[PDB]
Amino acid sequence: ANLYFPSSTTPLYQLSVPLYLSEPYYGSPLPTYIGLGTNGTSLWNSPNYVLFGVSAVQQYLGFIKSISVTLSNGTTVVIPLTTSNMQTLFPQLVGQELQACNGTFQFGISITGLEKLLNLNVQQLNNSILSVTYHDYVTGETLTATTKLVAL
Amino acid sequence: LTPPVSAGGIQAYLLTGSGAPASGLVLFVVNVSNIQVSSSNVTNVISTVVSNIQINAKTENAQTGATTGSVTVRFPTSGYNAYYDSVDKVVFVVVSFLYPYTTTSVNIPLSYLSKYLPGLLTAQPYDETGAQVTSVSSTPFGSLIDTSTGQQILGTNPVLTSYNSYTTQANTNMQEGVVSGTLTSFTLGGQSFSGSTVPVILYAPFIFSNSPYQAGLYNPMQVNGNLGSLSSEAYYHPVIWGRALINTTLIDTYASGSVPFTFQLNYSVPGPLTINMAQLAWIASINNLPTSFTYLSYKFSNGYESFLGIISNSTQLTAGALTINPSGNFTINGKKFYVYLLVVGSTNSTTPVEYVTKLVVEYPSSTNFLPQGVTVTTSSNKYTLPVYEIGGPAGTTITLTGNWYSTPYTVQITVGSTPTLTNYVSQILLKAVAYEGINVSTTQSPYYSTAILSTPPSEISITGSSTITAQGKLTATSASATVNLLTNATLTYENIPLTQYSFNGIIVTPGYAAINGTTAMAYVIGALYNKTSDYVLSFAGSQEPMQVMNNNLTEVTTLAPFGLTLLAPSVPATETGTSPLQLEFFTVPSTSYIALVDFGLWGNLTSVTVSAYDTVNNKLSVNLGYFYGIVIPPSISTAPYNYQNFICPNNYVTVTIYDPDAVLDPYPSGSFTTSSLPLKYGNMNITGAVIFPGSSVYNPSGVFGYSNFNKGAAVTTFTYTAQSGPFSPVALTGNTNYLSQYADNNPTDNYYFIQTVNGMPVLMGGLSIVASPVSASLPSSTSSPGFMYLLPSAAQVPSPLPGMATPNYNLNIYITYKIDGATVGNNMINGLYVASQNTLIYVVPNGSFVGSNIKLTYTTTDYAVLHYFYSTGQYKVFKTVSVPNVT
Amino acid sequence: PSISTAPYNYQNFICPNNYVTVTIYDPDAVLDPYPSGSFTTSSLPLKYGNMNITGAVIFPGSSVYNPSGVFGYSNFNKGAAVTTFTYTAQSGPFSPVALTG
Known part of the structure; x- marks a missing residue:
């Protein structure tokens, strides 16, 4: 499994932006979703799965990791968004699946809280990469998104 | 119609x-x-x-x-x-x-x-x-x-x-x-x-759609609209914005007759959440109080002022030039307490200026240390506790002297000339829950699909998650203590002797201007120091959603009695207890718009989960659907003109204008009004604004979800009365107060629905025309809203649906100067005059027939098109009618 | 038998629209040519020749037959139920077809 935006060519004058989780370990006939919780947590929620008559509950399946834009000076160091911010940045109570039997999971999320706290603007003070990250016990892997900012 | x-x-x-x-x-x-x-x-x-x-x-x-x-x-x-x-x-x-x-x-x-x-x-x-x-x-x-x-x-x-x-x-x-x-x-x-x-x-199954579409629920409004911010990563996104319509798929099969439906929406806010909360009140024992301060009342927008409830076990408090009734009184364990509720001001006012009614305070039981609910009552037996006022001129020192026990203690106001207001700013992690009402009968069955506003006119509860902890120094006779809650708010306790208590409480209110006063959230804690066979400090607290209404701080619900024990068989200790904290505000129906935009639970920084329920029949939705926000600037078009299309009185200028938020009522021969009832949602009875079918306003009574309900009769029916002006404009009338509740297929009354007070638009919406040189303007004071009747065609391609919401409204226009100088009675034929319903004629002078013009600005019907694509200069959208110069 | 390891596809456990059918080979273990049957077994004195060698007689039908008479003729009678066996649902966990009796 891998997280990715199909754009690393990303134009900037955006406040909400989507991306693909390609993750075909995590299919399910539709509808299905995930309760996005404490760390971003992938607390998998669908009452809409059956297998001979039983309704389904929360299943702890990972979490969104962080969000990091680049600081380079000759050693590699990052900037975290903190698990308080992440309870509120990914509070989403449904993110549905777009195609059955294969992960597709859509989140559309802010650049209004991102613009504000990482100190990104439309091109004013911007130039970075901007990669947001997920983790899962679904495939037991680190998996990070790909976007590069050219500084518009 | 629907399926998609x-x-x-x-x-x-x-x-x-x-x-x-x-x-x-x-x-x-x-x-x-x-x-x-x-x-x-x-x-x-x-x-x-x-x-x-x-x-x-x-x-x-x-x-x-x-x-x-x-x-x-x-x-x-x-x-x-x-x-x-x-x-x-x-x-x-x-x-x-x-x-x-x-x-x-x-x-x-x-x-x-x-x-x-x-x-x-x-x-x-x-x-x-x-x-x-x-x-x-x-x-x-x-x-x-x-x-x-x-x-x-x-x-x-x-x-x-x-x-x-x-x-x-x-x-x-x-x-x-x-x-x-x-x-x-x-x-x-x-x-x-x-x-x-x-x-x-x-x-x-009572769920919402997700098939065939690779986005979930469809938005027939999104696509068209100027953007360049999204390259190729976008191919997945469900969105709507504000008051603009998300059409839903309320799948339902399990009912007979009229099928009512209630809605629950669940909103939440991408991005960090610090919360600003003005100090609505403090309550404290006077041992726990400092022995001087400087303060003056902060005001609150439902009509309320700040107070401090002194808890003095003196028989007669001495605060101000006031002689004071026990505002509450209680007893525990032989000792009698007295609460004295006191506003502060530049005057003493002996009359209570506010009330708090039915205060329920917990404290720890003395054998078991499970919580003890009491309500505190005046010597005149009033649960409507008088919130008095002390003060007097500014600079003046006024010694709030009550005796904790019967030993003197003080806290002395210096009367400020400005408030010394301390607002609690702290991190909490919230959810917002919303509801709306509708009585549905339509011809789209079973598949009942219609148009729901993603900002309702009807109730919200904000409920969300924080931490409270209690820290306490068990000494061996006395006990210092404190409790921290909200994530910087606190309640202090100096010495608590054996068998004895201290009490502290605070009320928090979202410090703004239409949530402050108007909703409240109390936390009052009783704390007991004592021994059984082990030395015990204990806190027990209830916590109440409350609401000022008629000045009475009326309790909605109380939430959990939590008992927090700290046992120590050894003599010294300094232990902690923990409990969840729920910040719960349940506001007023209409603060769904109002306080909603004074927080900003909505933008391109929002995410939404949607749920439905069938009322009398009691049927629920187990899939919660979704969408998000991308705000878009409107596109706009018009349809032909030639210079020929002024000449001949059958050569016309078409227009078809677009602004995708400017429907509210889908489907020809629709029409609807509103009322309100306590509909069922879930396990309870939501006070929701029940949209009613028909042009007929209604007055139901009794309790709803039940057959205690029985629908009332016609109040006013809404009537586009053909006016007697030039070429007969057909303006909308009825009992025009209820324009509040009226929307119709016509877009020129879709903007009262929430954004009004009493039939008086707050948001202008629908098409907007001015003429020049000879001026006439619509909708306006010249021609009242709904100046003609108007209909959609058959919807968008972004709508996969035939015969539903199009913000494409279709009109015919000519311009003329060979009926120039004529008159319909003494109504002078010269200017723009609306030919009845979907026709128009512009008239102009005998020479300014060339350079005659007309300006169309289609006007937003959603507030939230403004957001971040106002800088496009197509938030509201801009086109014109014209006659070319020819030689 | 001889056999080798061989698994079945991952997507057939991810989605239950797909599911598997394991086919096991085990040669001597087959009883009765009549799937969609149900039956019972008694033992009776199988007349053959100059004798009656006793042995396991199978009867169709789900009920537990109680034979009478001397076995070996059209004279003979096959019995009837002593308890009728039946694949009932033991509900709670996912409804089985579980034999009671």
């Missing part, structure tokens, strides 16, 4: 509605139209089409969308009933499946069935052998022809007896069974057919 469109394979429909005729009869429709079907080849096509269809029955759990089984059977081909509607081009067959008609064919009406196929009425069906009949008669179940060994299916089926008492016996054991259809491809005439299904079946 798929064709060539199956789409199934229940026959139910308002006055349902027989529910459990089901229509199956397949579309053959990639070959042309005549009325002689019709015989060939429908025999073979029913020869390839297979018919099914699916087993799942009643609520789910996942797979555990099915079975398949087929239609007859010998003794077959098969039909062809010529107009829509569709081969269709109807079947009867539920009690008592399980066991027998019955004749299906071609009228109520005509609710889901139009061309049945306009042209009779066509039968086998190239005849045409009006009649439908279905195939009977248990005398079909199998494909199993080419046999015939039994007369008694499990599905038969399951439906022959469906009322219980369709609910089976762990599962349900649902009749469905499908097609295996074949070619005849030289083309193939396969398509898809979106829940509309004779029992259809």
Whole structure:
């Protein structure tokens, strides 16, 4: 499994932006979703799965990791968004699946809280990469998104 | 109408509605139209089409969308009933499946069935052998022809007896069974057919759509609109914005007669959440109080002022020039306490200026240390606790001297000339929950789909998650202590002697201007120091959602008594207890808009989960649907002009104008009003604004979800009365207060719906025209809102639906100067004058016929088009009518 | 038998629209050519020749037959139920077809 935006060519004058989780370990006939919780947590929620008559509950399946834009000076160091911010940045109570039997999971999320706290603007003070990250016990892997900012 | 469109394979429909005729009869429709079907080849096509269809029955759990089984059977081909509607081009067959008609064919009406196929009425069906009949008669179940060994299916089926008492016996054991259809491809005439299904079946799970679309729920508004911010990563996104309509898929099958529905929406806010909360009140024992300060009241917008409730165990407090009634009093353990509720000000006012009624405070039991609920009462026996006021001129020192116990203690106000207001700013992690009402009867059944505003006019509760902890120094006689809550708010405690208590409380209110006062959230904690066989400090606290209404701080609900124990067999200790904290505000219906935009629970920084419920019948939605935000600037168009299209009085200038937020009422011969009731949502009774069908305003009474309810009568019907002006404009009237509750297919009264106070628009919406040189302007003071009647056509391609919400409204205009100087009575024919309903004529001078012009600015009907795409300068959208100079 | 390891596809456990059918080979273990049957077994004195060797007689039907008479003729009678066996649902966990009696 891998997280990715199909754009690393990303134009900037955006406040909400989507991306693909390609993750075909995590299919399910539709509808299905995930309760996005404490760390971003992938607390998998669908009452809409059956297998001979039983309704389904929360299943702890990972979490969104962080969000990091680049600081380079000759050693590699990052900037975290903190698990308080992440309870509120990914509070989403449904993110549905777009195609059955294969992960597709859509989140559309802010650049209004991102613009504000990482100190990104439309091109004013911007130039970075901007990669947001997920983790899962679904495939037991680190998996990070790909976007590069050219500084518009 | 709705399903969102798929064709060539199956789409199934229940026959139910308002006055349902027989529910459990089901229509199956397949579309053959990639070959042309005549009325002689019709015989060939429908025999073979029913020869390839297979018919099914699916087993799942009643609520789910996942797979555990099915079975398949087929239609007859010998003794077959098969039909062809010529107009829509569709081969269709109807079947009867539920009690008592399980066991027998019955004749299906071609009228109520005509609710889901139009061309049945306009042209009779066509039968086998190239005849045409009006009649439908279905195939009977248990005398079909199998494909199993080419046999015939039994007369008694499990599905038969399951439906022959469906009322219980369709609910089976762990599962349900649902009749469905499908097609295996074949070619005849030289083309193939396969398509898809979106829940509309004779029992259809109460969920929301997600198939076929690779975004979930569709937005027929999103696409068009100027953007360049999204390259190729976007191909997944469901969005809506504000008041602009998300059309929903309230799938439902489980009702009879009129089907009411309530809504619950669940909003949440991407991005960090610090919360600002003004100090609505403090309460404290005077031991715990400092011995001087400087403060003056912060005001609150429902009419309320700040207070401090001193808890002095003195018989008579001495605060101000006031002689003070015990505002509350209580006793515990032999010692009597007295609460003295006191505003501060530049004057003492002996009259209570506010109340807090029914204060419920916990404290720890003295043997068991489980919480102890008490309410505190005046010596005159009032639970409506008087919130008095002390003070006097600024700079003056006024010694609030109450005796904790009967030992003196002080806290002395210095009267400020400015507030010294301390607002609690701290991190908490919230959710917001919303509701809305509707009584639905429409012709779109079972698949009841309509247009819901993603900002309601009707209630919200904000409920969300924080931490409270309690820290306390067990000494051996005395005890220092404190409790921290909200994530910087706190309540201090100096010495608490054995067997004895101290008390502290705070009220928090979202520090703004229409949430402050108006809603409140109390936390009052009693704390006990004592010993049993181990030295014990303990806190116990309840916590109350409350609301100032009629000045009375009226308790909504109280939430949990938490008892926090700290036992220490050893003599010294300094231990902690923990408890969750719920910040709960349940505000007023209308603060759904108002306080909603003073927080900002909405933007491109928002995410939404949607849920529904069926009221009297009590039916719920187990899938929560979703969407998000991308705000867009509007596009706009107009339709031809030539210089020729002024010349001749039959050469015209068309316009069709676009602003995608400017519908609120889908479907021709719609119309609706509103009222309010306590509808059921969930397990309880939500005070929701019930949208009512019809042009008729209504006045229901009694409790709803029940048949205690009985709907009232007509209050006002809304009447586009043809005015007597030039070329007859047709302005909208009624009892125009109820424009508040009126919306219609016309876009020029869709902006009162929430953004009003009392029939007085706050948001202007709908088209906006001014003329020049000779000026006339609409909608405006010249021509009242709804100055003509207007309709949508047939919707967008982004709408996959025929006959629903188009912000494409269609008008004809001319310009003329050869009826210039004429007069209709003494109404002078010179300027823009609206010819009745969807016509227009502009008149101008004998020379300024060239350079005559007219300016159209279509005006937003959603607030939230403004957001971040105001800088496009197409938030509201900008076009013109003109006459070219020619030589 | 001889056999080798061989698994079945991952997507057939991810979605239950897909599911598997394991086919096991084990040669001597087959009883009765009549799937969609149900039956019972008694033992009776199988007359053959100059004797009656006793042995296991199978009877169709689900009920537990109680034979009478001397076995070996059209004279003979086969019995009837002593308890009727039946694959009932033991509900709670996912409904089985579980024989009681």
